[PDB]
Nucleic acid binder design. Structure first.
Ligand SMILES: [Zn+2]
Ligand SMILES: [Zn+2]
Ligand SMILES: [Zn+2]
Ligand SMILES: [Zn+2]
Lengths: 137, 117, 50, 64, 51, 1130, 50
RNA sequence: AUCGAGAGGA
């Protein structure tokens, strides 16, 4: 079993009014790549941004791409919780899930908690650790 | 990214909670107790380091060089001051339990430089 | 045996020691020391027996 | 902490029942015997002892 | 049911003081309060006192 | 100047000798009791509030001063006389002294009509006195003077005599107070919970515990405090608000010393959000007041309740006075801060088993707990007695008001029974305190007087409190512990271990305000960041800027015997900036040699002055005053760098430490009294050392020098005790050389005839004939004739067959007119030693004579007659029985090698050397290899060397000047095989044995367990009254239990008739008559042959049923519960 | 011992035999191990017998 | 004698 926490490096909540001009400087490429094409309306999107930094090697260890993670997020929460993400090429494995339709800064934390702990990206729940080996006996 | 600290109101000295102003679409830091407001300079409201990439050098204090029970070594001179001897010890804390990494502290008084090999 | 355990202790101190699968770095160091010292105890026992 | 209280008006033991309407932040304490009723604001930390407290305080204040 | 004397023997002691058994003492308690309650329920007694 | 290595090994032991010349072995007991009498009683009397009683006239009844006189005894006439401890032992008196209290009672009615009447020395009670304490009549007496009072000079004291019985208080472990401890319970609704058992230093009150917890996993951590006397938890921020710190910044100033730390801050935040509703002190005090006093209370009173709890009940050690809330807030914030560090993992959870965290509750503080309770109850009775008189308006006499039996009987009862608490609360009370002093052998007495006890509960199966913690080093014997159900829970002091008696912190506090310290109400919280906190007895008193030179100053004050006394612990935690100073009692510590740069402070001048200790009165205590030795407690050892020997201080090719601070006086002082007997304990498997430490307490010897005058219930004295040929340097202080408990035996380790297999020994019959391991067993019989009332009176007098009713067929001719046997009369089993007759209501008197405990066959050693406390005749008869060792008697060496005597061969039957030496004992070689008791072999070889050389061997544990090679080389110089082997010859045939046998002197012990005290048989003896089954015990002529597991075994065997015999026929056969219709036991009259059931009203269908009596009893007890067990026979 | 000493001596390796004799630290660590054995023997009985 | 407690033994 692998939860999002096991493969996550660090999570943070920002106040990003514009997706076009993001708060962070290194995420400005793919975000503006995502937004000009109106697959998903800018107006619908909420100001409050959830940015999670995945570490590369944990993703590779479970052979997990951001595609699978984003699919799992969009399945568990449907379209109510938009998620976007870059390719598996950048030096930092990052994906941004700001809500798109108790205040949203509080709400988004409840969402973040619930995602990190009890969203199942892979495996079977209540199988915590597995060891492979050759039996000498 | 870095953590975010709590900020307090300047009238009642209670913590300022986040909120959003729709008619400037800008982040504000407002007190639920009084009716003070501030405009944020951060834009970041919450930060969780699951990896806990903490620099334990910040947790060390130079006074630990005074401990008679810590081991000392002459093989790792200080880059600050050139003092010849230095105490060393392990991380010994939660989320530093992995990795027996040695931290060194200069025993020269008033230098107190700390480092890691 | 002691001088091998010192070898292992410097490797761990200098981060020259990498974990084995299924164990944390502490637990691998402990394994590696305990299996140096059990080799020592068995070898000295053999010497005494012979 | 007991939930049923002696009424300050009729002195009937455990005759007062307390209702916490948290959605409206109001606690209502009513005696079953003498039908005296009192309403006070409550918080999420409040308890029936606090509502009965506010009732006793209101009685003593009004009786001055 | 009061049990017989063999279930609750009154053992004699180094002298003549006959020590009774715990069951006998307890039956003493039950009897006294039963008699006392009986005279109260027979007479006029407060419902809370009878209770 | 410097002590060189060649001299060290006696320099150190010279130092050790001086310690035991100054302190002794029971110093902790005597110091505790002394502190209790000098301080604790006066503190308790003054700390009680004056009892103001008025209808009008009023009276206060101060108590102001105590006087404890010497122990005296009042006869029936009442003349006070000085009572000596041996008289108390013989007459079954309580060795107690009267406590008098000065009382001041001032009349105040009106019009300034004031007048004080002081009653000087009002007899308030009787305090039992610890022997050899400062207030004991044996105090300061010389060995002359003790012998001349019939006291043993070697008797350590340290115990009480209650009703003639010697009672010893066992030190009780408890978890230290006023210290914050953060633990984490794996199975609980809290990730982390910090607690402090706060207790004001002067024992005004019991310890009050505050808990500051962490709610289990907005869902963020929530911090609540469990205050005393408040029904429900409280969020911490409301407690802080209730202390007047309303703004959220002000609260965090106390909780978080560095605001730059994000991570602390974010953790605390949920509690701030959880208390956001309450914003001001009066609502917070309201909120707290609501939980507690009553459901309905006026608001002003609720506030007064919350205030009263906060300043008094919460954290009393911080303060109880008004205007302390800054102190309270800082200490409470410090508790929360500690919780946060534990929750963040910056700081480790506290360890419950660290003795730095534990305190030993000794005789003094325990008697103080009793005295507090009993003086409270006494004052209550004075109030009541005075109150009725004032209600009627008449004057009351205080002497009549004071019923002194409460203090006297309370202390006497609790020390007599061991139930530590009020006699009424006999089940809430904790037993095992105040045990009967072991007087089997001198080592057992010493160990029992140095016994510690961990009240975890023997039922508990968690091994953690039973494990030998690292911190027991030098404090507790690693070996001496019972091997039964209490293993590791009952402990023993190490030899130089000293439990602190307690001290006042006021000199230290006063000095701290001289020096660079700043109060806690006087600082701004911003300063706490890089400053160092200073705790004193748990109490955060201030902060400091340079902790290093503070610690230097404080250490160097304590080493000068300045304001800081020696037992004060001063720990500097460096990584966390605390300096914790401890002066309280119960801290186990030990002496250590201070070390300079790399150099002992102990020079040859000190050893020289110590050598002439008997001339220039240069003692231990001058060694301490010279700053050469220091007492270090368990908690301060964490900051100490110890050298095992001065050889560790020596500059090496690779320096291990090079910054030592202290040195061991000698490592062998980690052992206790009984483990210090073991020779070469570092060559044995540790379980063997533990088993010996247990068995040295069952070894016979001379338990005390004045045994001729003691009327002990059981006593064993060895005819010919010998000091061991192979000894440790610690026994010089245990006085084992002066009261030894064994004999040096010529042990051969051989297989000879097979009668020593499986932990058994073959003894020399001839040696036994010459007195080898012969002992005398003394058994004392009590009796008293009670004239309790004219209804029935007992009297000692030779009974007669014509007047006495319950006369056994045993002859009473050995008794005298007075009813008491005479000394020198040989008495066999079932014989009469005291003829006592009790008047009836075989006429007008019944026999109640005292018989011998059956199957003893001794000789009356002596008969003492006196009067007991109330004053009737009282007789003690000591009977004497010579115990010659025989097959089945248990013997042991000092290495856990126990075994019974398998057979005894005469000298011509035993194997002999070329020079005709036969072994006294032959033990089997198969007892060595699995046990790995190489100390036994090394002791045998060393003993051969010692006997051939005219030495006493040195078997001190860690001694590099003694190993097996050097002993073997010594033994080869006396014409013996260097390894202790000899050619033996078969005693039966005279042929040489092909294997050369290992033979030599080894110290053996005869243990109390003789077969003649264990053999027992039964064939239709007495039965128990309730269930008609065989009695329990040898003494009761009882039967052996055929238990459930024997039943199970015989079921597996398939032996149904044997099982029925054991569980029906041989225990309690019985018959009942059962109604065939209802199956209930009917009424049978076998004389008139009439059989009827009152239930069914039938008298023809009744059946006989053969059942056990216990089953009939069970069925009757089931009807007692309205159950109908109906034995249907169809 | 110095702090953070994972060497064989420090953590309870007895490099001596019973004939050679244990050093004081070895003696204490050996007493700790033997105490573990004694506790096991005294605590398993109730629970196995049940 | 009963009850409880404690200390021990295997
Ligand atoms: Zn504000
Ligand atoms: Zn430096
Ligand atoms: Zn009412
Ligand atoms: Zn019937």
């Amino acid at each position: 079993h692998t939860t999002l926490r096991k493969v996550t490096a660090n999570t943070a909540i920002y106040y990003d009014p514009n997706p076009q001009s993001t708060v962070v400087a290194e995420d400005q490429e793919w975000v503006n790549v995502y937004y000009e094409m109106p697959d998903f309306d800018v107006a619908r999107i909420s100001p409050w941004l959830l940015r999670v930094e995945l570490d590369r090697k944990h993703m590779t260890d479970r052979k997990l791409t951001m595609e699978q993670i984003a699919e799992k997020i969009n399945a568990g929460f449907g379209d109510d919780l938009n998620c976007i993400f870059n390719d598996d090429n950048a030096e930092k494995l990052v994906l941004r899930i700001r809500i798109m339709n108790m205040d949203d800064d509080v709400f988004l934390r409840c969402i973040e908690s619930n995602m990190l702990t009890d969203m199942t990206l892979q495996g079977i729940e209540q199988i915590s650790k597995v060891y492979m080996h050759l039996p000498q006996t | 990214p870095g953590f975010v600290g709590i900020r307090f109101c300047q009238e009642c000295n209670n913590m300022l909670y986040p909120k959003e102003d729709k008619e400037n679409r800008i982040l504000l830091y407002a007190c639920r107790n009084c009716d003070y407001q501030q405009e944020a300079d951060n834009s970041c409201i919450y930060v969780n380091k699951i990896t806990h990439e903490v620099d334990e050098l910040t947790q060390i204090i130079a006074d630990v060089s005074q401990d008679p029970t810590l081991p000392r070594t002459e093989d790792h001179p200080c880059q600050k001051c050139g003092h010849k001897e230095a105490v060393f010890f392990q991380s010994h804390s939660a989320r530093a339990e992995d990795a027996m990494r040695l931290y060194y502290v200069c025993t020269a008084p008033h230098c107190g430089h700390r480092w890691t090999e | 045996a002691k001088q091998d355990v010192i070898e292992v202790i410097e490797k761990a101190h200098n981060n020259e020691l990498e974990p084995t699968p299924g164990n944390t770095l502490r637990q691998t160091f402990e394994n590696q020391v305990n299996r140096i010292l059990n080799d020592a105890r068995d070898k000295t026992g053999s010497s005494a027996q012979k | 902490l007991e939930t049923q209280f002696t009424c300050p008006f009729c002195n009937h033991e455990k005759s007062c029942d307390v209702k916490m309407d948290r959605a409206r932040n109001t606690g209502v304490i009513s005696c079953t015997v003498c039908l005296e009723e009192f309403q006070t604001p409550i918080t999420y930390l409040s308890e029936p002892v606090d509502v009965y407290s506010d009732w006793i305080d209101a009685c003593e204040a009004a009786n001055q | 049911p009061v049990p017989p004397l063999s279930v609750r023997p009154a053992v004699v002691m180094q002298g003549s003081a006959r020590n009774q058994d715990d069951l006998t003492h307890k039956l003493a308690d039950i009897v006294k309060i039963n008699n006392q309650l009986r005279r109260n329920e027979q007479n006029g007694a407060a419902a809370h006192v009878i209770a | 100047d410097e002590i060189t290595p060649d001299l060290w090994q006696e320099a150190c032991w010279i130092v050790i000798s001086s310690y035991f010349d100054e302190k002794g072995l029971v110093r902790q007991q005597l110091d505790s009791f002394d502190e209790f009498i000098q301080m604790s009683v006066q503190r308790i009397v003054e700390d009680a509030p004056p009892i103001d009683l008025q209808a009008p006239p009023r009276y206060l009844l101060k108590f102001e001063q105590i006087y404890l006189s010497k122990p005296t005894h009042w006869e029936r006439d009442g003349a006070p006389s000085p009572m000596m401890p041996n008289e108390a032992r013989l007459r079954n008196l309580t060795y107690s002294a009267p406590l008098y209290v000065d009382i001041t009672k001032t009349v105040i009615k009106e019009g300034e009509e004031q007048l004080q009447t002081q009653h000087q020395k009002t007899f308030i009670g009787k305090i039992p006195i610890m022997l050899r304490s400062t207030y004991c009549l044996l105090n300061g007496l010389t060995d002359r003077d003790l012998c001349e009072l019939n006291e043993c000079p070697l008797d350590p004291g340290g115990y009480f005599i209650i009703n003639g019985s010697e009672k010893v208080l066992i030190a009780q472990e408890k978890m230290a107070t006023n210290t914050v401890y953060v633990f984490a319970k794996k199975d609980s609704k809290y990730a982390y919970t910090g607690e402090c058992r706060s207790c004001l230093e002067n024992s005004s009150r019991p310890t009050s515990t505050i808990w500051v917890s962490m709610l289990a996993r907005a869902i963020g951590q929530r911090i609540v405090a469990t205050l005393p006397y408040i029904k429900q938890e409280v969020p911490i921020i409301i407690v802080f608000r209730a202390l007047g710190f309303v703004s959220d910044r002000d609260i965090l100033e106390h909780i978080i010393y560095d605001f730059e730390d994000p991570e602390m801050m974010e953790m605390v935040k949920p509690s701030l959000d959880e208390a956001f509703v309450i914003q001001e002190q009066n609502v917070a005090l309201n909120f707290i007041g609501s939980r507690g006093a009553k459901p309905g209370v006026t608001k002003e009173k609720r506030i007064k309740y919350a205030k009263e709890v906060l300043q008094k009940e919460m954290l009393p050690h911080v303060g109880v006075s008004d205007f302390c809330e800054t102190k309270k807030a800082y200490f409470l914030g410090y508790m929360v801060h500690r919780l946060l560090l534990a929750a963040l993992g910056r700081r480790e959870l506290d360890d419950r088993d660290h003795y730095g965290n534990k305190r030993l509750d000794l005789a003094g503080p325990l008697l103080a707990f009793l005295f507090r309770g009993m003086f409270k109850n006494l004052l209550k009775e004075v109030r009541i007695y005075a109150q009725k008189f004032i209600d009627r308006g008449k004057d009351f006499n205080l002497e009549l008001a004071i019923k002194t039996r409460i203090i006297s009987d309370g202390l006497k009862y609790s020390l007599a029974t061991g139930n530590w608490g009020d006699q009424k609360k006999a089940h809430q009370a904790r037993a095992g305190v105040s045990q009967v002093l072991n007087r089997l052998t001198f080592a057992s007495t010493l160990s029992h007087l140095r016994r510690l006890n961990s009240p975890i509960g023997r039922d508990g199966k968690l091994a953690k409190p039973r494990q030998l913690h690292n911190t027991l080093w030098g404090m507790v014997c690693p070996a001496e512990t019972p091997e039964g159900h209490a293993v590791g829970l009952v402990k023993n002091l190490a030899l130089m271990a000293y439990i602190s008696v307690g001290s006042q912190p006021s000199p230290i506090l006063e000095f701290l305000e001289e020096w660079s310290m700043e109060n806690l109400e006087e600082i701004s919280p911003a300063a706490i960041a890089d400053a160092t906190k200073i705790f004193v007895n748990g109490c955060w008193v201030g902060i400091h800027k340079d902790p290093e030179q503070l610690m230097n100053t404080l250490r160097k004050l304590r080493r000068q015997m300045d304001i800081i006394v020696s037992e004060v612990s001063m720990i500097r935690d460096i990584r966390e900036r605390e300096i914790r100073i401890y002066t309280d009692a119960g801290r186990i510590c030990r002496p250590l040699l201070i070390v300079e740069k790399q150099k002992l402070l102990l020079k040859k001048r000190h050893i020289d002055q110590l050598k002439e200790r008997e001339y220039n009165n240069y003692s231990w205590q001058d060694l301490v005053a010279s700053g050469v030795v220091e007492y270090i407690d368990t908690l301060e050892e964490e900051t100490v760098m110890l050298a095992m020997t001065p050889d560790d201080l020596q500059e090496k090719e690779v320096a291990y430490c090079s910054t030592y601070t202290h040195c061991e006086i000698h490592p062998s002082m980690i052992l206790g009294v009984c483990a210090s007997i073991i020779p070469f304990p570092d060559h044995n498997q540790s379980p063997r050392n533990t088993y010996q430490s247990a068995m040295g307490k069952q070894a016979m010897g001379v338990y005390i020098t004045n045994f001729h005058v003691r009327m002990d219930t059981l006593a064993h004295v060895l005819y010919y005790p010998q000091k061991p040929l192979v000894t440790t340097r610690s026994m010089e202080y245990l006085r084992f050389r002066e009261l030894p408990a064994g004999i040096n035996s010529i042990v051969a380790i051989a297989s000879y005839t097979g009668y020593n297999q499986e932990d058994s020994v073959i003894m020399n019959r001839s040696a036994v004939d010459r007195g080898f391991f012969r002992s005398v067993f003394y058994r004392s019989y009590k009796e008293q004739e009670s004239k309790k009332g004219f209804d029935q009176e007992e009297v000692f007098e030779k009974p007669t067959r014509e007047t006495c009713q319950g006369m056994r067929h045993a002859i009473y001719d050995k008794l005298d007119d007075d009813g008491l046997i005479a000394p020198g009369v040989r008495v066999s089993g079932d014989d009469v030693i005291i003829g006592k007759t009790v008047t009836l209501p075989r006429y007008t008197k019944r026999d109640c004579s005292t018989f011998l405990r059956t199957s003893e066959t001794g000789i009356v050693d002596q008969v003492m007659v006196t009067l007991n406390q109330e004053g009737y005749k009282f007789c003690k008869i000591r009977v004497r029985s010579v115990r010659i060792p025989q097959i089945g008697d248990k013997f042991a060496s000092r290495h856990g090698q126990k075994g019974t005597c398998g057979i005894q061969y005469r000298q011509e039957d035993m194997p002999f050397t070329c020079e005709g030496i036969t072994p006294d004992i032959i033990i089997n070689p198969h007892a060595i290899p699995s046990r790995m008791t190489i100390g036994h072999l090394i002791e045998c070889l060393q003993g051969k060397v010692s006997a051939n050389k005219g030495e006493i061997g040195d078997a001190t544990p860690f001694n590099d000047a003694v190993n097996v090679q050097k002993i073997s080389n010594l033994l080869s110089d006396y014409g013996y095989h260097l390894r202790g082997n000899e050619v033996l010859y078969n005693g039966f045939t005279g042929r040489k044995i092909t294997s050369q046998i290992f033979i030599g002197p080894t110290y053996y012990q005869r243990l109390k367990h003789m077969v003649d005290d264990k053999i027992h048989s039964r064939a239709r003896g007495p039965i128990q009254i309730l269930n008609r089954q065989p009695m329990e015990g040898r003494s009761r002529d009882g039967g052996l239990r055929f238990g459930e597991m024997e039943r199970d075994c015989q079921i597996a065997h398939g032996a149904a008739q044997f099982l029925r015999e054991r569980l029906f026929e041989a225990s309690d056969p019985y018959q009942v008559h059962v109604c065939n219709l209802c199956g209930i036991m009917a009424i049978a009259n076998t004389r008139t042959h009439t059989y009827e059931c009152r239930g069914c009203r039938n008298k023809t269908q009744i059946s006989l049923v053969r059942m056990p009596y216990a089953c009939k009893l069970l069925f009757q007890e089931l009807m007692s519960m309205s159950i109908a067990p109906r034995m249907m026979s169809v | 011992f110095i702090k953070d000493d994972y060497g064989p001596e420090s953590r309870g390796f007895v490099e001596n035999s019973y004939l050679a004799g244990l050093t004081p630290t070895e003696f204490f660590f050996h007493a700790m191990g033997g105490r573990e054995g004694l506790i096991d023997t005294a605590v398993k009985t109730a629970e196995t017998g049940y």
